[PDB]
């Protein structure tokens, strides 16, 4: 089997991407944030504290003839950005782009943090990291991909995120029309439960490529590109007037600037992030200070190849017995 679904930016900055997901019978369609950095499929629901729902579409398990309470199961998650959610668990039928999993754990939120409430466009998350990170207790549950994998034509999914435009998540096949040149594959460590890999270096604008190993995670659920302070300083030094602002929480730059591109290495291959992908707009409405899309990972504890990087590529998440990651230009 295969599946193919369009993923759409939630706003004009590409702060996140939402993908429609069918849950239950009859189908209830929710727009979920596909997150290769976590491993829980959780949704706003009829059980969510009423004051914490503000415009989201909810899953109502009592209206699904295929929903079953997973007795005794609870979940609770905290994300790197400080947001969190928790609740109980149902199993139900879940379909993405025509690919159906029966008996998928659907984690129903009883509580969500303010950041989730305040974002009316995201109805929940669909985790695509390794199932070892799933938070359901006392019996850990499998991701949608893990459940689908054996049935797929090939045990892969691909992320093709757009810049200020829709893109695609495919399951079970590689669309050879969706990229240019070849896909370069690189090794993955699953030791921390992430799609963790090592970039071979970087360049700023038309500058020389610096060969250096940068360990990090391919994370569709993180907006920005978080890299070591040395790398980030080298980038922003090429933007007149750019500076790190402790008050704002990262590098800012004059909105009048033209940003240089940023290249990262995948083996001997190179992925070029155009300068405009690194612009996250005014820090507050009407400001002429703009927020940068490349930020320091210092004190995150891990480098993160978030959407800023991934949207410059066609990305293969290869879930073979020994997983790997593939990157192509597009």
Curated annotation (Swiss-Prot):
Enzyme Commission number, as recorded: 3.4.23.22
GO molecular function terms listed in the Swiss-Prot or TrEMBL record: aspartic-type endopeptidase activity
Transmembrane feature ranges: none
Family: Belongs to the peptidase A1 family.
The keyword Ribonucleoprotein is annotated on this UniProt entry: no
Cysteines joined through disulfide linkages: 255-290
Name used for this protein in its record: Endothiapepsin
Key words, A-Z: Aspartyl protease, Disulfide bond, Hydrolase, Protease, Signal, Zymogen
Residues the record marks as active site: 35, 199
Catalytic activity: Hydrolysis of proteins with specificity similar to that of pepsin A, prefers hydrophobic residues at P1 and P1', but does not cleave 14-Ala-|-Leu-15 in the B chain of insulin or Z-Glu-Tyr. Clots milk
Organism field: Cryphonectria parasitica (Chestnut blight fungus)
Biological processes annotated in GO: proteolysis
Range covered out of full length: 90 to 419 of 419
Keyword rRNA processing part of the UniProt annotation: no
Domain Peptidase A1: 17-328
EC top class, as a word: hydrolase
